[PDB]
Scaffold this active site. Structure first.
Site, PDB file in Angstrom:
ATOM      1  N   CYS F 129      -1.839 -12.777  11.383  1.00  0.00           N
ATOM      2  CA  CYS F 129      -2.292 -12.598  12.770  1.00  0.00           C
ATOM      3  C   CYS F 129      -3.476 -13.438  13.201  1.00  0.00           C
ATOM      4  O   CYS F 129      -4.318 -12.950  13.946  1.00  0.00           O
ATOM      5  CB  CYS F 129      -2.625 -11.110  13.043  1.00  0.00           C
ATOM      6  N   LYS F 194      -5.088   0.407  15.417  1.00  0.00           N
ATOM      7  CA  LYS F 194      -3.880  -0.157  14.799  1.00  0.00           C
ATOM      8  C   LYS F 194      -3.980  -0.085  13.288  1.00  0.00           C
ATOM      9  O   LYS F 194      -4.735  -0.852  12.681  1.00  0.00           O
ATOM     10  CB  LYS F 194      -3.710  -1.624  15.211  1.00  0.00           C
ATOM     11  N   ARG F 204       9.077  -6.594  11.764  1.00  0.00           N
ATOM     12  CA  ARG F 204       8.849  -7.960  11.264  1.00  0.00           C
ATOM     13  C   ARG F 204      10.148  -8.734  11.081  1.00  0.00           C
ATOM     14  O   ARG F 204      10.184  -9.956  11.249  1.00  0.00           O
ATOM     15  CB  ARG F 204       8.069  -7.902   9.958  1.00  0.00           C
ATOM     16  N   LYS F 246      -1.399   3.148  17.065  1.00  0.00           N
ATOM     17  CA  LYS F 246      -0.179   2.656  16.429  1.00  0.00           C
ATOM     18  C   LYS F 246      -0.305   2.630  14.916  1.00  0.00           C
ATOM     19  O   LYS F 246      -1.303   2.154  14.393  1.00  0.00           O
ATOM     20  CB  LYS F 246       0.163   1.258  16.895  1.00  0.00           C
ATOM     21  N   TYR F 311      11.607   1.951  21.458  1.00  0.00           N
ATOM     22  CA  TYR F 311      12.819   1.110  21.416  1.00  0.00           C
ATOM     23  C   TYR F 311      14.066   1.862  21.949  1.00  0.00           C
ATOM     24  O   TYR F 311      15.127   1.257  22.158  1.00  0.00           O
ATOM     25  CB  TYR F 311      13.080   0.602  19.972  1.00  0.00           C
TER      26      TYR F 311
HETATM   27  C1  LIG Z   1       1.189  -4.552  15.548  1.00  0.00           C
HETATM   28  C2  LIG Z   1       1.479  -4.838  14.088  1.00  0.00           C
HETATM   29  C3  LIG Z   1       2.942  -5.211  13.812  1.00  0.00           C
HETATM   30  C4  LIG Z   1       3.029  -5.874  12.417  1.00  0.00           C
HETATM   31  O1  LIG Z   1       4.078  -6.471  12.129  1.00  0.00           O
HETATM   32  O2  LIG Z   1       2.054  -5.804  11.625  1.00  0.00           O
HETATM   33  C5  LIG Z   1       1.882  -5.237  16.752  1.00  0.00           C
HETATM   34  C6  LIG Z   1       3.316  -4.767  16.993  1.00  0.00           C
HETATM   35  C7  LIG Z   1       3.536  -3.276  16.726  1.00  0.00           C
HETATM   36  C8  LIG Z   1       4.965  -2.817  16.546  1.00  0.00           C
HETATM   37  C9  LIG Z   1       5.336  -2.637  15.063  1.00  0.00           C
HETATM   38  C10 LIG Z   1       6.614  -1.791  14.897  1.00  0.00           C
HETATM   39  O3  LIG Z   1       7.260  -1.441  15.910  1.00  0.00           O
HETATM   40  O4  LIG Z   1       6.970  -1.468  13.731  1.00  0.00           O
HETATM   41 ZN   LIG Z   2       0.069  -9.971  14.661  1.00  0.00          ZN
END
Ligand SMILES: *[C@H](CCC(=O)O)CC[C@H](*)CCC(=O)O
Ligand SMILES: [Zn+2]
Ligand SMILES: *[C@H](CCC(=O)O)CC[C@@H](*)CCC(=O)O
Ligand SMILES: *[C@H](CCC(=O)O)CC[C@@H](*)CCC(=O)O
Ligand SMILES: *[C@H](CCC(=O)O)CC[C@@H](*)CCC(=O)O
Ligand SMILES: *[C@H](CCC(=O)O)CC[C@H](*)CCC(=O)O
Ligand SMILES: *[C@H](CCC(=O)O)CC[C@H](*)CCC(=O)O
Ligand SMILES: [Mg+2]
Ligand SMILES: [Mg+2]
Ligand SMILES: [Mg+2]
Ligand SMILES: [Mg+2]
Ligand SMILES: [Mg+2]
Ligand SMILES: [Mg+2]
Ligand SMILES: [Zn+2]
Ligand SMILES: [Zn+2]
Ligand SMILES: [Zn+2]
Ligand SMILES: [Zn+2]
Ligand SMILES: [Zn+2]
Lengths: 323, 323, 323, 323, 323, 323
Positions: F129, F194, F204, F246, F311
């Site tokens: 990131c 987060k 991912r 999150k 989703y």
């Molecule tokens: C936050 C971190 C995602 C990551 O791949 O580390 C940004 C997106 C959040 C959604 C992740 C999900 O829906 O699993």
């Molecule tokens: Zn990222």
């Protein structure tokens, strides 16, 4: 009767009551207000405050030694001016009465904690706590002067600069001024919550403040409890070392609410009118002075005050009533 | 200077300060304590309470009419007894001084809110607030007698039975006795938090309480703030309609703390010592009486009191100083 | 640098620090635990508690006079038994060691506040705090016996019955038994929150408790802060006059949390292990004993304790270190 | 008996007590204080702290590997100086003892979290925590030096700069200094609430601090609980990564109050005097060392500490007592 | 940029993150739910719960030994009935499946903490948790039966009686019945806050609950957070030893809110639907099972749960992933 | 039975339950995450997230119109890059995938609220990131780039810049950057709390982030509840328009604690792993997808979330399950 709960169980004897007493009062809780008159010879009695007298400047060394020998750890100085003018400029003169009261105290008794009342009502011809204007007492003109007076009293040895002018931003002004002159270690005892009380008559006679009108445009309304808290917290924000509620006797609700809103030490002023009410009721034989004085000072401690300014402190100290 | 916050802005004029005043005091907030002496002809001046006098029972009908016409809404009755004994039994005599004071007031001004002080210190030979025993003041024997007194004062027309004996469980005892006798609608104004104060000397003079020792084994320690709250909350649990802090003047931290711990109305008693302290310094010219009285009563309201027992109430009413 | 806030300002001198000290400790805050051994002639030194000794019952009248003359206001009695059995029945014998210790103290110094430790671990052959059963220590059988013990200690003159058996409902059981026997005025000093601590070894040596296992099935888990509060609040609900945290030294977070959850007085027991830890490092020259004792007791007061049980109390009194 | 509530139900067995234990202690909660003496050959025993020894600098690589192999995740370094002067300037020399203790630790064990004690009392001839003045320890002269020492220790690899000088504005000073030198990622473990305790004697002998007077003009008063909270919150405001209470054993009330006033991690220092009291009482056979050590450390965790500095950590780690 | 506060500083390495981790999870926090089917020979796989199987009653002694050897401290028993009827009476049969499951477990591993699930949905022909009536599930008739079931499960050795019928007053009913039968020491693990969740499908498959409608008239609304707290506080008032939130996974706001409203221990049930959701995405390769299980159980602990009912507990134990 | 309180009274029927339901869920509470792949032709299915597919950039106009027609008020954009490099510089190119996803959405549906995921893990060759360093992900190098990407996405029409890089000071950086470029009205949806969760695997794969290691040096520890609150409040201080937790499903305790600590709107992300666990359990026939999805989203609302990223939103919208 069927009572599981009997509050009286712990009230049966003097020993039980002693063990369960929640609040204590000692000599260390007291700061003694002293009135010093320049250019004079004899002690002058204050009619409105029986037992209280203006100390002649030439006798201050003697008195502060007496006070200190009694066990008093601190004094708040008030001068009676023979040099009053429009802006009370005697107060910021390096050798004015303000600077000299501090100097004489710290030099005679180095360990004495000297708090210097910081205002202009005892040094202005009009008797108001600052620079007068077509407007009224000019806030920011006064702040400049408070800062100047703060530096000379700090230089004279005062341990606490105690602003009692009730000017907005007074603590910041004085904090800024002391710091710049190299007095970053000098503390500020702010009369942070100072009401426009009717209990100061005896004090004005003793300190000779020449005011004909009133202080309602700067000292705050007695009825305003939320405003009282805001007043003190603005001073905490400004850097004050200690906060204060004045008067104290009839504002114990304020003292308690404030204690719950800050980690700062809180002083409380048992004012001249309170001193006067206790003295005249005792003289008329209506109350027992000592029991009433101890109960009064005890309540101020109970409400949350860390320090109490009291005109009874010396007598309480010499008579070994408080230790 | 640069200050965004200037508390002084709303202090500039009497109109601005009037707009922003947080607390107000009306005649409605005051309850008038009255001293009635049976078997006498002339009103007697109470020396310790400049301006207060014992009302002759023969003139009570005229005085209660006078008070009611002044706009005073409520009184607290106190009798001076000519028939004292070991248990203060005249207090629960269907036609004793206590029942008669209520009877006269309610018969004369039916709309008058009559609170009957409920104790024995004024009716006992020893001057203690209950039954004396090898033990001291016997809590449960006094509870029995307080209940009997309650029913006859209710029977005479008292609107509130006000226990001031400082006996544990007194509110529960009085509530059971009233309900049982068919007085489920009679209210209880409990002297719930009542301190073993040194401020009642003038009152004892005016009420003729024949006490040589003290009340420290029932009235509570002035220094105990936690205990003070617990004392009133226990009375709330037992059914009191109204609670009370006595004295008030030096206990506004207690009033404030209690206000935040209950939804019940809270009374505050501006005691005789407070009255004498104001009266005597006013007479010695040290303070302005009217300004000090209004500031003191205002403080009590500011601290959270819903009702204030005050000896200054009739003068305040008649001089149209409070409406 | 530029710092408005300088905590160091009020730390500059002993006088400034004295003025701003938030907590004080007096002789009045201390309760002295005393060990009395029946049927012996010479005082016995407790090896694990340097300076402490078992007082011979024959000399108790002389020792309680000595303690009272030192200015100690209260004691907690602990007996060493020569008549132990399966249920510790000598403890509820109208003339057993427990009743006698109280009798002697109160007869000798009527004003002495006598707290009688209320358990059985010192009177049972197995050394457990109650009736042993197939089960372990039987809660309800021990409640029965604790009540009987309560009435005879009250009958002998104990001012407080102090249950330390850690049995559920012990305060309610003791309160009912006392009231029923006409001891409605006897107080209960509950060892309300009493941990299954590893700090009582020295005490068990001094008191002769004959225990081979542990007290983990009644005394509570040292790690349980939520449970600790719940333990004391349950005792408040059952009528205790005073609550307690034991040990104190390593549990000041518990004292503070409880202080904020009740208006009741709170005792804190500076246990034998704490005393031994101070005594032995002082003897090894690692610390200054007096400075450490006063700081430890001061901390207990700072955390919210109203009374502290402390083995150092008589030396502190006699050496006029605390008044 | 009739009890719905029986706390003893969950105390019946070791399994039940285990399931309901509220607080846990692990090796990860411990940080180990190490004393390293420069220019020396053999380990020197610390008399006042049985089991503790000065590690010769030449043997530090060996020791930190040993410590790390035991499972210890972190150490706090204290150096014994052979190069003391007026300002303790050895501490900010790029290769002074401070920088080298860190360098040797981080280079021998890269994953070891190294906290560097940051002060001058171990490097000044007078033994005071900073630059001396006619005034006393000069706050701002010391801040400059703390910042300089912070940068060299940060450059030497220290993970935490742990200011223990008790100087006002110390965290800001060091935060400003590290940032400017490019050490914006280096953390600050502030001894934010550090009392002027009498429990540091054994530590001064071990770390050889040459002080004859005391630290009361900078370390805070033991009795001041409101001031203790304010001390730590001023450091949170200043950017500290972790806060701390020292001493920890007798200040669990402080630890708990602080836990409730911040989201920041809080460290607590089980000081040398505590270590000493436990060791000497155990040596005298008065207590069980291990049970007492685990109960002590457990209480610190219980009170709210996230990390505990303990001289017992290695032994607890090697003997597999904590994992 | 200029940031004093950098949360990332304590995230740099696994060692730093380990030091600053606020929550930990041990094997001790877990309770293992077990399915026992009477009158069968082979273990039956529960399709909806990959890895879970019904234990044949004939093999229960071997499985409970296996669980106990894995280090699991407690189990919750659930039976699959071959003797169902209208009121589920086999559940209160002195020798029915419910009594037998407890008997076997406690006889085999005396130290095993046995919690007996207390309901009827597994023993009734209609699959509802109690007595069906014209009304729906009859609350008070089911209370009667729950009490009878309680006494026989206690009689068989259950350590906790766990009511999951969602009947009002179920804790009080079970507590009275247990005490009356001489089981005052048997504990109650109340399913105090138990939602009418759509996450129990896998469990009903595994337990053979024969229900065609829903439990919405007794189990509570998933959306009602205020009601959820009120549900558990009512059970606290009725004597529960432990409370519970079920399900846990999607209700951690409820766990947190309840933690702050009681001092009682709180259990949280990681239900069958949560287990199946993890198991099936792990099997589809979408997530790492072990990482997800530990994060989920850790979250439940972080939210305030003291104990967690979890089907993953034996694998976690045997694979030495949690100790 | 005797029960005044019967929670079941309001559970008797669907109408009663409806009337007393405390929490509601509507379509307006949902924000739909969309994956858009540049330079491609056909929709690509995401294996780990059944039902989810990468939308070809050339088909985005069609899809956002479809989404908008379904009633969806908002989307969060995630791009799959065909132009990955060391610093993920495609993200701040005026015409990079980030800018174009926003542009195509706002231009096709002007009323659609477009939130732009703001990071570099989908655009960096290493998958981290931000800007990599010998150190790890460089905080301040990344802040500069986030600000640059913020301005081009803001210029492209994005309504919210949603930083998900977990960099300290990220909100300030982006707030400063948007303001200076004249985008003072563009809002910031900060992924303020987060966690370094194990629930992002399916995401991912769908967004194609090329990371081999982990994000534990920047995303925060799952176990740290106090740190979680501090994370979000630092962003409120920095100016964020909306805060977020999150993952959301297993962090409802965090959501609820945060709701109680700020007046700001709070978003909560129902992550891919949660979506995956529900989808695979439903596919295996173990749960009812729709009931479980509504209960899941309902709990997030119940815990205090104002907005939920899900989703499932489109399917819920088209099937008229939520309106
Ligand atoms: C936050 C971190 C995602 C990551 O791949 O580390 C940004 C997106 C959040 C959604 C992740 C999900 O829906 O699993
Ligand atoms: Zn990222
Ligand atoms: C309680 C106390 C009176 C006493 O102790 O003599 C009942 C009367 C309160 C008013 C006393 C006063 O006004 O001083
Ligand atoms: C309770 C615990 C004593 C024990 O368990 O032996 C009653 C006595 C408290 C003081 C013990 C001490 O001072 O160690
Ligand atoms: C209550 C709910 C079970 C049901 O309603 O069928 C008792 C069992 C809780 C665990 C259920 C699960 O794990 O899904
Ligand atoms: C405050 C205001 C005094 C005034 O005259 O207005 C500074 C001094 C306070 C003491 C007044 C007193 O004791 O009455
Ligand atoms: C704080 C003050 C130590 C001192 O000598 O004044 C820095 C080190 C703390 C540890 C002291 C101990 O362990 O006793
Ligand atoms: Mg002001
Ligand atoms: Mg009472
Ligand atoms: Mg108990
Ligand atoms: Mg500091
Ligand atoms: Mg219920
Ligand atoms: Mg952040
Ligand atoms: Zn003035
Ligand atoms: Zn009376
Ligand atoms: Zn015992
Ligand atoms: Zn130092
Ligand atoms: Zn059921």
């Amino acid at each position: 009767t069927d009572l599981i709960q009997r509050p009286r169980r712990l009230r049966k004897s003097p020993a039980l009551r002693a063990m369960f007493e929640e609040t204590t009062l000692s000599l260390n809780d007291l700061v003694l207000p002293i009135f010093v008159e320049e250019e004079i010879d004899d002690y002058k009695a204050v009619e409105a405050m029986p037992g209280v007298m203006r100390i002649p400047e030439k006798h201050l060394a003697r008195e502060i030694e007496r006070i200190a020998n009694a066990g008093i750890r601190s004094v708040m100085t008030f001068g009676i001016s023979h040099h009053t003018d429009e802006t009370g400029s005697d107060a910021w003169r390096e050798d004015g009465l303000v600077a000299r009261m501090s100097r004489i105290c710290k030099q005679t008794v180095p360990e004495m904690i000297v708090m210097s009342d910081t205002c202009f009502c005892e040094y202005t011809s009009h008797g108001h706590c600052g620079v007068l204007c077509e407007h009224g007492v000019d806030n920011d003109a006064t702040l400049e002067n408070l800062g100047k007076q703060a530096v000379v009293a700090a230089a004279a040895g005062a341990d606490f600069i105690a602003p009692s002018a009730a000017m907005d931003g007074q603590v910041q002004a004085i904090r800024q001024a002391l710091d710049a002159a190299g007095f970053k270690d000098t503390a500020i005892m702010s009369y942070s919550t100072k009401f426009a009380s009717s209990f100061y008559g005896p004090f004005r006679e003793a300190a000779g403040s020449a005011l004909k009108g009133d202080r309602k445009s700067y000292q705050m309304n007695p009825m305003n409890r939320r405003e009282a808290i805001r007043e003190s917290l603005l001073d905490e924000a400004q850097g004050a070392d200690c906060l204060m509620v004045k008067p104290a006797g009839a504002y114990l609700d304020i003292v308690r609410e404030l204690r719950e809103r800050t980690e700062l030490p809180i002083g409380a002023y048992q004012v001249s009118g309170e001193y006067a009410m206790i003295k005249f009721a005792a003289l008329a034989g209506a109350i027992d002075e000592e029991k009433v004085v101890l109960e009064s000072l005890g309540s101020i401690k109970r409400a949350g005050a860390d320090l109490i300014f009291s005109y009874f402190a010396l007598d309480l100290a010499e008579k070994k009533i408080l230790r």
